[PDB]
Design a protein around this nucleic acid. Structure first.
Lengths: 65, 93, 292, 49, 48, 49, 1114
RNA sequence: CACCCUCGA
DNA sequence: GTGTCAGTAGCTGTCACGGATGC
DNA sequence: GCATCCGTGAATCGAGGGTG
């Protein structure tokens, strides 16, 4: 009984949102969702996802996560 | 910002308009699977899913299915928050 | 008195038929939760038992109607359904209450709103608040009237997010997450940083019973060692607070408007006079008057 | 009503056994009716509020 | 008196004292006995 | 009716409220305190707000 | 000398009155009750020498009332007898360790009698595990020591009440016949001068209805009750007449809805009041009724039931009392006065202790089994039936478990210090089943009653909402087999005090007149003064001639409790501060080392010993081998007994129960001597605190009104240091996705935090742990469908979650013990648990700013400053004082005791020497010769209501011993010249300086400090939790909201009730805005109000929120 | 969390 | 499928007050 | 037309511990 305090999850997202401005709008529109809408390949998906993640991982670990 | 708070008698029609389904069976849950019994006091078709985007029969357990009414168990797929606001009802004979 | 009731239905436009129900609503499950016990058994809300008894009798009524049972049974069952719905809405209102295990009257939906434990008085007129603490009070003669002394361990928790912010700004921590870990492990860097945070940030001191408004006053916090709150000797009269084990609660105003309200309206120095009589309260009262 | 027999002793002199026992009626009823007086006072206060 | 008197006053109750009042200004009529008490007032101006 | 139902006789007040189909003008200290609006007093009045 | 019986230290008493009877066993209330319950040999010998005839143990009584068991025909019977016990299942301490119940198996001898076959089968049947009482009067349930508190109930019998009507202003009367079990019967006279009777709460029938139902003709009724017009009018205004008419009237009002048969009603109307099945007055009830009506005053108490004669005589008593009659003789009965009963008088207010409270539960269980027996008889064959087939012991064990586990009287034992536990075991509680509800206790049940003298203490009672409902048994008081509280008195023959002591009850005491304890008595026994203070019936105090005193009090302290008797100079303290002193002595914290008080009362020794937290030698002998672990005693006969010391044991309240041997190797020790003392004990005496050098003066405002200043010496020398132990617990359960495992391998945890853990994830013994540190590493597998989208991404951009046992906030100490239970290793855990770990953490708490100290006179205060030893005002010879108490908070409270206690204290520290030359001075003529000379650090006793008189104390201050340099520091007034350690200039005026006994109360800032930023929220109301243990927030109540509104701080109020409380989105945005440095966002709507709307809808109320235009908004 | 106990200003 | 009697515990040890309820 | 009886209400905050 009783619900925890959303500290961690919220701090985590507050970082994730701080490593989302360090992106390009295309990697952003892709990560926020798929190959049927954006009108591109599935290899373009896989890649943009792949490199975009690695940019996210790079940025996060840059900050010291 | 909302001005007035109205209160009044609830017409039977209003009682039915609120309810997302009638509570037919008297059962509560299962004491082994922890799953709420269908049409019981915790029916997931009526009140909502126990877990977020997890239906009863287990066909839809992912977030991709947003707003899908499962055909095998009839449970919607939103957040469990709705179990704090969806009303039921009993139709009296 | 009869007109008082009839003219209501006349003007308002709602039918009196609403007082007789054909369907009864079911309260959402999270407001009648069923919790598990550490022994493997289950505990449930009383509303579940009430609703369940109503459902049982209603389904039995359907059975009796379909089976053409004797009129005596059908009528004597409708009576029981009536009594069960009466208990669901306001158990104990008519006759004897529905006893649970141990001859304990079960709580009804109307019991959720009555008295001190009802929703209105317990959970609406007065909530429980984050950013708050409490501790034993000790007299602090050296303090100024506008000052109060709180323990370091109290302020650290109260100002936890502020300390995290300033620890991540001054590069004592890589990210805000590690700043939280630092505060939770109480690393020595915080104590020097904490002073910058609490600087001129007023807090509110409250002592129950809060009889009049001077039962709550604002103060400038001063980091003190130990684990007791240091209170000015002159405000004791307002709080009616002696030092024989009394405890006081501290609240941290967060919004700029809250800090302004505490700094201007509620600061101890701006509330020297009693609002009831106009005569001063923060004055030499016991030992002080004797020395003078 | 006041007891036709007083408490002659002072706390410096030292109460007798029965003197203390007879002081206790008033003392305990003092505490009790003080609790009750506070209850009624707080209720009146919330009404006035 | 006491605190219950404060409650009697704030709740607009029919007090314990229930003291009467002069409905019309006039001359007093002390008609005291021992069986009971009855008092009349003769209005200073007109009245009954 | 919300300021009265939170004082005394909660059921007795809510019954009359539902019969008279009463509407609560959310303009009072107790009510706004309940729903979390700014109290129409002190720094909450429209002159200072 | 004081307390010269076991071999205790020689404490010298200022006693003027001799003690004719030494204090009884302070633990006899629990002991005797339980021994009577199980009929131990000791109890049976006690009843044998007491003159009892046919005594009955508690089990034997229940089994006799049950036997025999017959069906409706009577062809089969079953009988029980001879209950016995085998050895205990497990020892006491092992029960505590393994979370089981201390019990012994109960055996009975049952036999089946077959009437249709003429053959009987008799065997032994195991009835159940019976909870056993410890030697200290405690029970152990599931590894917790509990105490069964004696209950004050309304005694069975007949009671009369005179009420006053509100509207008609006429005197009405009522009667209640309260049985020990069964239906109730209350008569009354309404305001129409008619008599009626209510049978079992039911409707009020005319009193003649009952007489008609019993077979009495209307004419004979008029014959008996003709002297009253009210009874004539009752028989006239009656509705129906006829023996077979009123009977059916009663039937249809008592058991409605059933066909009324003449015999079906004749059966129950005889069974409910005259058959022993469903109605029974205990022996005490029958005796009480027999006195109040004046019938059967010579018959042996054999009728356990009500009789028609009793009813007739009762109605006569009532009707005569209504019309002013003051005397009555029942037809064929002795003359008896006509009066109303008090129901608060301790002759009508009975006390039922552990034995009886447990007997009732065993009785319930036995009846529940009896019914199942009668059903199982007529089902099985009538030749293969054995006692084992008929007996179902499930309800019996379930009954005793229901009692001890759930009952207002099975209370968690108070174990702060030995005195607290003793007092708890000697409690008298008015609340509980069969007694009354708290809401049903006026200002009259709580105040002191004149019958409490020598029975219940008028001082020791809580000051909270339970004031007057909970008392402490008086010192010399005992409980009789009936349930009333007896107290001893000295029989005065012919104005001569005799050593013959007799115990009287309340009503028995009222039938005589008793003199106060401190009456002047001749060396032979004759009273010196003709007039003496005397207590008289109805609580009337007056002087009476010496030739009128029948008895007198035993000891001056006869009326007080154990704790109250522990207040020196008690006669000089008001009942308020005395109440606080006695109640706070039970809150004393056991210190690292204990010092017996200089100024005592005499009760310390027996309090400590009878408490049971020390180690007394059962039989005399010599010490063969003594260690810190155990003490072996070699008796004279040749046998050896070894007592094991309890070392660093956690008390129920976190205090440290630690026993230390006193005797040495090869020490001759007598029987009953203290060989080792435990917490708050010194050489066998209660040492609840320390002797501190006190100066009574204001000091720079740090002691302002009741604040206390202390010397850092008490910190440096651990004078007020105390040990506290916390128990931490965690379990490894089976989850839906696997099983929680306790492992040192925790995901994303550094090797630095895990450095203090063993290979299992458990902290190692001796490691110092701060708050937040890991004690037991447990991880629980979490499913994939429960992961946050940001959590799932963080998992992708990089299945168990951390559930380790961390140290709670505010805890810190050395890990002293670990206990591990594993289902894999035979350890029986609740179903679904595989492992369980308990870690014991011990903290050595020095005295800190804010800790609460107090004396024995309700003189309490917190520590406002601990100055260095050099800053303290020091005496002439350089010794700095230890504690500074403000003077202003002294003369208001009327606790002159401390003052006296202070003075005498100094005289005890320095000693004195009275000028013996030229005769004994005139003030010390009444002092014993043992007091005319005293060495420094001497122990003295000031018995309550006796002891040191102000004159003798004045003299002793005149003859105080000088110090080692030959200088007398304190004046005859008791004051001394002190030097300000901060400036050096001597203080302008002399200051009262002495030694006071100060106790460290269990109210320490280390436990009471708390603060919260965020934390758990209740699921339903979404408001922060409550309590420090749950990391909750403080409650901004209704009055505090009024305070905000009064200040006009609108925004602060909204903030408190929205973003800081239950605004689900607002509080999160506040957290984010703080860590971002942005401004505070706008508060939203409280979730609790959404719940309110949904709740109003659940009651068929259509609540809707309308906008300014009129459209309903969702 | 439901009740229960004991306690503190 | 059921089949001779086959039958609550508990409890009143609160109170002041107004007005609908009921004789 | 009026006594009875029903229902309403009765201070604030805080600590620990038990069981269903």
């Amino acid at each position: 009984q009783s619900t925890p305090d959303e500290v961690n999850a919220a701090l985590d997202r507050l970082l994730i949102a701080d490593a989302l401005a360090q992106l390009s709008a295309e990697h952003r529109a892709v990560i926020q969702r798929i190959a049927t809408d954006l009108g591109i390949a599935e290899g373009t998906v896989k890649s943009r996802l792949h490199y975009a993640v690695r940019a996210l991982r790079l940025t996060l670990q840059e900050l010291g996560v | 910002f909302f001005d007035e708070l109205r209160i009044g008698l609830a017409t039977a029609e209003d009682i039915r308009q609120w309810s997302y389904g009638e509570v037919k069976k008297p059962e509560t849950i299962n004491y082994r699977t922890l799953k709420p019994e269908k049409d019981g006091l915790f029916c997931e078709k009526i009140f909502g899913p126990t877990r977020d985007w997890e239906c009863y029969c287990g066909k839809y357990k992912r977030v991709r299915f947003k707003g899908i009414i499962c055909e095998r168990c009839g449970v919607e797929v939103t957040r469990a928050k709705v179990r704090r606001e969806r009303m039921g009802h009993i139709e009296l004979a | 008195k009869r007109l008082k009731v009839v003219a209501a239905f006349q003007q308002s436009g709602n039918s009196p038929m609403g007082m007789v129900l054909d369907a009864v609503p079911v309260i959402p499950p999270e407001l009648r939760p069923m919790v598990q016990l550490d022994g493997g058994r289950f505990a449930t809300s009383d509303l579940n038992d009430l609703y369940r008894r109503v459902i049982n009798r209603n389904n039995r009524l359907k059975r009796l109607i379909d089976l053409g049972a004797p009129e005596i049974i059908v009528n004597n069952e409708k009576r029981m359904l009536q009594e069960s719905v009466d208990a669901l809405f306001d158990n104990g209102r008519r006759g004897r209450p529905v006893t649970g295990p141990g001859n304990r009257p079960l709580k009804s939906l109307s019991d959720l709103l009555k008295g001190k434990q009802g929703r209105f008085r317990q959970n609406l007129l007065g909530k429980r608040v984050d950013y708050s603490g409490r501790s034993v009070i000790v007299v602090g003669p050296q303090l100024k009237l506008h000052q109060c002394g709180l323990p370091k361990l109290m302020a650290l928790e109260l100002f936890k997010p502020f300390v995290m912010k300033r620890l991540v700004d001054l590069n004592h921590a890589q990210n805000i997450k590690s700043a939280k870990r630092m505060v939770e492990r109480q690393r020595p860097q915080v104590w020097d940083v904490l002073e910058e945070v609490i600087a001129e940030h007023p807090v509110l001191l409250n002592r129950a019973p809060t009889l009049h408004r001077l039962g709550i006053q604002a103060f400038e916090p001063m980091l003190v060692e130990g684990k007791a709150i240091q209170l000015h000797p002159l405000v004791c009269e307002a709080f009616n607070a002696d030092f024989d084990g009394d405890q006081m609660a501290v609240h941290l105003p967060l919004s700029a408007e809250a800090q302004a309200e505490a700094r201007i309206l509620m600061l101890s120095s701006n509330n020297i006079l009693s609002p009831a009589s106009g005569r001063p309260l923060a004055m030499p009262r016991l030992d002080m008057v004797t020395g003078l | 009503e006041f007891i036709p027999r007083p408490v002659k002793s002072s706390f410096r002199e030292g109460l007798t056994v029965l003197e203390y026992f007879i002081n206790t009626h008033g003392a305990r009823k003092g505490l009790a009716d003080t609790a009750l007086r506070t209850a009624d006072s707080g209720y009146l206060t919330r009404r006035l509020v | 008196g006491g605190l219950p008197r404060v409650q009697e006053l704030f709740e607009a109750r029919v007090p314990r004292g229930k003291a009467p009042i002069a409905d019309v200004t006039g001359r007093v009529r002390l008609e005291d006995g021992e069986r009971f008490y009855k008092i009349t007032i003769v209005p200073d101006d007109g009245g009954e | 009716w919300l300021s009265a139902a939170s004082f005394q006789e909660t059921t007795r007040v809510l019954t009359d409220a539902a019969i008279n189909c009463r509407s609560d003008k959310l303009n009072g200290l107790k009510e706004n305190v309940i729903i979390g609006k700014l109290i129409p007093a002190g720094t909450g009045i429209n002159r200072y707000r | 000398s004081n307390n010269s019986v076991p071999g205790a230290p020689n404490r010298v008493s200022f006693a003027k009155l001799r003690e004719p009877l030494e204090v009884p066993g302070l633990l006899d209330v629990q002991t005797d009750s339980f021994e009577w319950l199980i009929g131990s040999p000791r109890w049976r010998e006690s009843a044998a020498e007491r003159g009892d005839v046919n005594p009955v143990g508690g089990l034997e009584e229940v089994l006799y009332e049950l036997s025999p068991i017959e069906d409706f025909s009577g062809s089969m019977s079953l009988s029980f007898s001879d209950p016995r016990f085998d050895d205990v299942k497990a020892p006491v301490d092992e029960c505590k360790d393994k979370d089981m119940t201390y019990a012994a198996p109960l055996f009975v001898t049952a036999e089946f009698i077959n009437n249709n076959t003429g053959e009987i089968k008799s065997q032994t049947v195991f009835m159940g595990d019976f909870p056993m009482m410890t030697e200290k009067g405690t029970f152990i349930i599931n590894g917790t020591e509990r105490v069964v508190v004696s209950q004050l109930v309304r005694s069975p019998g007949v009671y009369f009440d005179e009420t006053i009507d509100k509207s008609t202003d006429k005197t009405l009367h009522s009667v209640k016949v309260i049985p020990s079990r069964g239906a109730w019967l209350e008569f009354d006279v309404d305001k129409r001068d008619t008599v009626g009777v209510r049978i079992d709460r039911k409707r009020r029938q005319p009193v003649t209805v009952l007489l008609k139902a019993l077979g009495w003709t209307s004419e004979q009724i008029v014959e008996r009750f003709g002297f009253s017009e009210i009874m004539r009018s009752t028989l006239e205004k009656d509705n129906t007449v006829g023996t077979d008419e009123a009977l059916l009237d009663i039937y249809r009002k008592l058991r409605p809805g059933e066909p009324p048969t003449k015999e079906s009603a004749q059966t129950l109307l005889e069974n409910l009041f005259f058959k022993e099945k469903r109605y029974d007055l205990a022996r005490v009830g029958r005796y009480k009724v027999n006195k109040k009506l004046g019938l059967h005053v010579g018959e042996p108490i054999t009728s356990s039931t009500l009789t028609e004669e009793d009813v007739v005589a009762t109605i006569e008593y009532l009707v005569r009392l209504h019309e002013g009659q003051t005397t009555m003789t029942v037809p064929g009965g002795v003359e008896v006065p006509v009066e109303t009963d008090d129901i608060d008088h301790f002759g009508n207010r009975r006390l039922r202790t552990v034995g009886e409270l447990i007997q009732n539960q065993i009785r319930v269980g036995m009846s529940r089994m009896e019914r199942v027996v009668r059903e199982r008889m007529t089902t099985q064959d009538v030749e293969a039936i054995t006692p084992q087939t008929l007996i179902n012991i499930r309800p019996v064990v379930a009954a005793i478990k229901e009692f001890f586990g759930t009952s207002q009287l099975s209370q968690f034992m108070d174990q702060n210090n030995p005195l607290s536990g003793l007092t708890h075991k000697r409690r008298l509680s008015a609340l509980g089943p069969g007694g009354l509800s708290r809401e049903r206790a006026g200002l009259e049940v709580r105040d002191v009653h004149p019958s409490h003298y020598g029975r219940m203490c008028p001082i020791e009672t809580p000051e909270g909402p339970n004031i007057g409902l909970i008392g402490s048994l008086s010192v010399y008081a005992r409980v009789n087999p009936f349930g009333f509280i007896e107290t001893p008195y000295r029989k005065v023959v012919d104005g001569v005090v005799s050593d013959e002591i007799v115990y009287l009850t309340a009503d028995e005491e009222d039938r005589h007149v008793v003199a106060q304890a401190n009456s002047p008595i001749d060396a032979d026994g004759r009273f010196v003064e003709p007039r003496v203070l005397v207590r008289r019936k109805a609580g009337e105090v007056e002087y009476v001639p010496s030739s009128e005193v029948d008895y007198m009090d035993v000891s001056p302290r006869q009326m007080v409790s154990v704790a109250t008797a522990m207040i020196p100079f008690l006669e000089h303290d008001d009942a308020n501060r005395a109440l606080m002193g006695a109640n706070m002595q039970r809150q004393a914290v056991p210190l690292v080392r204990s010092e017996a008080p200089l100024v005592g009362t005499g009760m310390e020794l027996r309090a400590a010993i009878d408490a049971g937290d020390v180690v007394v030698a059962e039989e005399s002998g010599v010490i063969e081998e003594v260690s810190a672990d155990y003490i072996t005693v070699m008796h004279d006969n040749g046998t050896r007994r070894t007592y094991r010391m309890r070392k660093f044991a956690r008390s129920n309240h976190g205090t440290c129960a630690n026993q230390c041997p006193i005797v040495d190797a090869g020490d001759r020790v007598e029987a009953g001597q203290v060989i080792a003392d435990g917490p708050c004990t010194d050489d066998g005496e209660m040492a609840l605190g320390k002797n501190l050098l006190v100066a009574i003066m204001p000091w720079e405002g740090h002691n302002y009104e009741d604040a206390i200043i202390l010397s850092n010496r008490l910190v440096e020398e651990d004078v007020l240091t105390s040990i506290h132990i916390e128990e931490h617990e965690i379990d490894a359960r089976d989850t839906k996705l696997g099983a929680e495992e306790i492992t040192r391998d925790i995901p994303n945890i550094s090797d630095e935090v895990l450095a203090d853990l063993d290979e299992r994830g458990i902290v190692r013994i001796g490691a110092e742990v701060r708050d937040g540190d890991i004690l037991v590493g447990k991880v629980t597998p979490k499913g994939e469908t429960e992961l946050t989208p940001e959590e799932r991404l963080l998992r992708a951009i990089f299945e168990v979650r951390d559930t380790s046992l961390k140290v709670p906030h505010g805890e810190s100490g050395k890990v002293i013990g670990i206990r591990v239970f594993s289902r894999e290793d035979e350890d029986e855990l609740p179903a679904g648990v595989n492992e369980l770990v308990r870690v014991y953490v011990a903290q050595k708490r020095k005295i800190s700013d804010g800790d609460k100290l107090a004396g024995r006179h309700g003189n309490k205060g917190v520590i406002g400053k601990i100055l260095p030893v050099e800053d303290m005002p020091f005496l002439a010879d350089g010794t700095p004082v230890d504690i500074i108490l403000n003077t202003h908070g002294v003369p208001r409270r009327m606790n002159i005791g401390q003052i006296l206690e202070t003075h005498l204290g100094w005289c005890a520290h320095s000693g004195w020497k009275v000028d013996a030359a030229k005769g004994v001075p005139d003030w010390a003529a009444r002092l014993p010769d043992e007091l005319l000379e005293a060495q420094p650090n001497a122990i003295v006793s000031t018995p309550v209501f006796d002891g040191a008189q102000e004159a003798e104390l004045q003299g002793l201050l005149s003859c105080t011993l000088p110090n080692r340099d030959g200088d007398v520091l304190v004046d005859a007034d008791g004051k001394a010249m002190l030097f300000d350690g901060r400036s050096g200039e001597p203080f302008p005026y002399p200051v009262t300086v002495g030694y006071m006994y100060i106790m460290k109360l269990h109210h320490l800032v280390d436990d009471k400090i708390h603060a919260r930023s965020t934390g758990p929220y209740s699921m339903i109301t979404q408001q922060p939790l409550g309590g420090k243990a749950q990391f909750g927030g403080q409650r901004f109540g209704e009055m505090e909201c009024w305070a905000m509104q009064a200040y006009g701080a609108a925004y602060t109020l909204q903030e408190l009730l929205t973003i800081k409380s239950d605004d689900t989105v607002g509080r999160v945005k506040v957290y984010e805005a703080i860590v971002k440095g942005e401004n505070i966002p706008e508060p939203g709507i409280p979730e609790s109000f959404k719940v309110l709307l949904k709740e109003l809808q659940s009651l068929c109320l259509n609540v809707e929120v309308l906008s300014s235009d009129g459209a309903a908004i969702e």
